Design an enzyme around this catalytic site. Sequence first.
Site, short mmCIF file in Angstrom:
data_model
loop_
_atom_site.label_atom_id
_atom_site.label_comp_id
_atom_site.label_asym_id
_atom_site.label_seq_id
_atom_site.Cartn_x
_atom_site.Cartn_y
_atom_site.Cartn_z
N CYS A 39 14.83 60.78 28.89
CA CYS A 39 15.02 61.95 28.04
C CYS A 39 14.75 61.47 26.63
O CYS A 39 15.65 60.99 25.93
CB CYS A 39 16.45 62.51 28.19
SG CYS A 39 16.84 63.86 27.07
N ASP A 43 13.56 70.22 28.46
CA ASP A 43 15.00 70.36 28.26
C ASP A 43 15.30 71.48 27.27
O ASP A 43 14.50 72.39 27.08
CB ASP A 43 15.60 69.05 27.76
CG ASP A 43 16.83 68.64 28.56
OD1 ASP A 43 17.52 69.53 29.09
OD2 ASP A 43 17.10 67.42 28.65
N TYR A 51 19.96 76.72 27.31
CA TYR A 51 19.37 77.03 28.59
C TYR A 51 18.77 78.41 28.80
O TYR A 51 18.30 78.71 29.89
CB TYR A 51 20.31 76.62 29.73
CG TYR A 51 20.23 75.12 29.99
CD1 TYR A 51 21.15 74.24 29.43
CD2 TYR A 51 19.21 74.59 30.77
CE1 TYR A 51 21.06 72.89 29.66
CE2 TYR A 51 19.11 73.24 31.00
CZ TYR A 51 20.04 72.39 30.44
OH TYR A 51 19.94 71.05 30.67
#
Lengths: 349, 349
Positions: free
Chosen positions: B225, B298, B313
């Site tokens: 990440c 992400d 999200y």
Amino acid sequence: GSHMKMSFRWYGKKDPVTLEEIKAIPGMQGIVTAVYDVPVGQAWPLENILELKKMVEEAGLEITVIESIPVHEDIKQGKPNRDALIENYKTSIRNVGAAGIPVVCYNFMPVFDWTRSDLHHPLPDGSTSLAFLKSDLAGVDPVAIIENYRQNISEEDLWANLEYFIKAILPTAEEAGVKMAIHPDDPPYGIFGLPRIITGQEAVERFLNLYDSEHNGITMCVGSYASDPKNDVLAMTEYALKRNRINFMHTRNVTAGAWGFQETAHLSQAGDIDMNAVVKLLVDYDWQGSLRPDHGRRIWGDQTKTPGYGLYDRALGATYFNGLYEANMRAAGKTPDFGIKAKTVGTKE
Amino acid sequence: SHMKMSFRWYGKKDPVTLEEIKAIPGMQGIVTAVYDVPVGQAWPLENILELKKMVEEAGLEITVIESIPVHEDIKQGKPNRDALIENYKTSIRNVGAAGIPVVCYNFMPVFDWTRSDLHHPLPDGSTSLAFLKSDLAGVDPSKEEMKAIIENYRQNISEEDLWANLEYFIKAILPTAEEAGVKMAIHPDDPPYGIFGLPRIITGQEAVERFLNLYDSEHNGITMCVGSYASDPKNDVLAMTEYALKRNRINFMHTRNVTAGAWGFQETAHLSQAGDIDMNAVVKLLVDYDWQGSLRPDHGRRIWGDQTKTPGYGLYDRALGATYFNGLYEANMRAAGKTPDFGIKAKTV
Ligand SMILES: O=C[C@@H](O)[C@@H](O)[C@H](O)[C@H](O)CO
Ligand SMILES: [Mn+2]
């Protein structure tokens, strides 16, 4: 040096999509818009243009392209009174230059700006879209002007009508500091007995030659030109780029063949255009101008009415071009720019 | 050399739907977990199948599972850990019993992330997650349980202790995972330094080398990440990315963008110039090394009135990221000489 501004089409106050939303598209710099309170062929006042510019600038954007000072059918027909409508076009050009907007986009498409049999033709992932089904209906009269073009006005009459136009306006555009960018015919061929002349490479070359200047260039609308497979977008793009005559880029993807056409997601492999190859060309040629994703699909709850002009998928097309533009800028050891002046508001080291 | 664009889905309860997720161009992989089994207890095939069936019908596929969560008791090395590791053992087997080839998970005491602000303003008027150190200076972090969990970690568990707890966990579960085909991929520490006097170990290049070495097997891997790692300026994600590729140790990908300082950090648009990471360099390396696995946009910004309240999200900016990565991918592929690929079967119905 290369300098491509991302842009987005916006229909003004009455647009479903707002300037906040547009501004939120990463890398978005330009607004492409027009005056809608004035009838075709009547002449845009400065204040009108200025009202739009103020809205756009406060939202933190700029108008980089007027997309579309409409061309009156009298002009296209080449009727006796054109002269007056053209003087109005001259006034409009002048008022746009007065506002500081560098490019004006227009078309010379008799009575129809575009044709679509289906505005909700499903795609292999659940999403609707626009298509031109060559089979369906096509070959039926659209239930005075039409018969005129059908009966009287040939492609060469249209060529001569257009030449008159561009000889009449071009010096004004020069004085105004404004570049013209003719939009091709959509579909890029004769339909309904109506003639079409802005259709391919041969046509582009003959067009540019009508008045040989940068102020007299094209809107390279790749998804229109390649709506007729007979056409090759990339050589078209390049010859145009080789000639320094691209003044606006439109960049939507479409799938075509002997059967006709249907607009797809912008991704190269979603349709028949090699999008990477297009922008690689802009990169190589240090192209300076604006590109809009142009047209989108219906995805998600997108309750934007007006055809391929829902915010969602067009947005998804823009960032895809960010990707292609940045990668190719870097592959050429150039450093790409997106107009980002600040990363943060209120922190910093 | 095929990277499969993917996207996290939170199950039947996600206000984002698979219709919507399938609608994103090039989007192939889904990324999810089971939500009705408490934490430590075993993951039944019935539960992972019923989500795999819910997704396979939607035209999409599970490429990675985002998190079977390691229990605090495992993280703390408490004696009751063996049974918890047991229940975790079968999760790996049940998941291998579904073709799904990757499992992400963390080893982060107490929290899985920390932000100071979940609607921090960006320059373009959108909002995003931010961790601002000085604002978390004041704060002192069941409820009577967590207090004592924090006391335990602070006073009694040191970095080396937590290395030891992890090593125990790793050598326990890896053969189980090589036995099921499933590759493990550890989500880095987010952020990657001590907060609130709690220890963190998955924090940088050193940690990586060490973590790999706990069990030098291609099934013992990381989730790179880049966003989590770049949140600390001392880190060089480009080097970290390459290092780990040369060892064939990237089993999964979080391509999120941040800007960072001694002041903390703020999540941005995926576009490079919006943050501190050169996403192009990243994706290029993934290309150069022929990396095979799924990459995932992400967190995204909150844009366009998105009401979705789970951290970063919402669907919009997440999707805008994905298509931007399509563009980075495709471009770098062709620039190499290779030929890209997405979920694309038929251009049309
Ligand atoms: O930064 C945090 C995100 O990745 C979240 O989706 C989630 O909290 C963890 O991945 C699972 O603990
Ligand atoms: Mn994450």
